[PDB]
Design a protein around this ligand. Structure first.
Ligand SMILES: [Ca+2]
Ligand SMILES: [Ca+2]
Ligand SMILES: [Ca+2]
Ligand SMILES: [Ca+2]
Ligand SMILES: [Ca+2]
Ligand SMILES: [Ca+2]
Ligand SMILES: [Ca+2]
Ligand SMILES: [Ca+2]
Ligand SMILES: [Mg+2]
Ligand SMILES: [Mg+2]
Length: 150
């Protein structure tokens, strides 16, 4: 990684990838990775394996989808973070687990957890972009409330 925009590409093992400043792309590959966007607007994709994703400050994009395993987002700041899930919104479940938000793809064991979502706004992502539609924070909370009474 460098202060410039980098494309950081892991391998099938457990990799640590730190983007540093600049608007980076982090592709972990298989294995259980640690990905840090740091400063800047970063795109993080843990891919297969159970990954820890730290977008950092700035407006970060997290990818998720079928076969991505159990990944955990640890946010730090930014008013325009996004999760881009390669599935229809009609296949997403939302639940509060402790202080975390858990997002599941129905029919799979792929699960994305936002650590400490419910602690304060700096831990949150602001939009979920599914294949067909976008869901904002008020929308995510309505889904969590609806799904908890399901
Ligand atoms: Ca960066
Ligand atoms: Ca960089
Ligand atoms: Ca890897
Ligand atoms: Ca991985
Ligand atoms: Ca960042
Ligand atoms: Ca961020
Ligand atoms: Ca993963
Ligand atoms: Ca945020
Ligand atoms: Mg700064
Ligand atoms: Mg782990």
């Amino acid at each position: 990684g460098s202060a410039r925009d980098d494309v950081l590409i892991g391998d099938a093992g457990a990799n640590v990838l730190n983007g540093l400043a600049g608007n980076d792309v982090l592709s972990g590959g298989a294995g259980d990775d640690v990905l840090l966007g740091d400063e800047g607007s970063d795109l993080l994709s843990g891919d297969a394996g159970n990954d820890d994703l730290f977008g950092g400050q700035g407006d970060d994009t997290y990818l998720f989808g079928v076969g991505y395993g159990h990944d955990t987002i640890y946010e730090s700041g930014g008013g325009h973070d996004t999760i881009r899930i390669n599935a229809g919104a009609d296949q997403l479940w939302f639940a509060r687990q402790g202080n975390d938000l858990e997002i599941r793809i129905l029919g799979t064991d792929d699960a994305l957890t936002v650590h400490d979502w419910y602690r304060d706004a700096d831990h949150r992502v602001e939009i979920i972009h599914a294949a067909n539609q976008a869901v904002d924070q008020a929308g995510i909370e309505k889904l969590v409330e609806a799904m908890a009474q399901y």
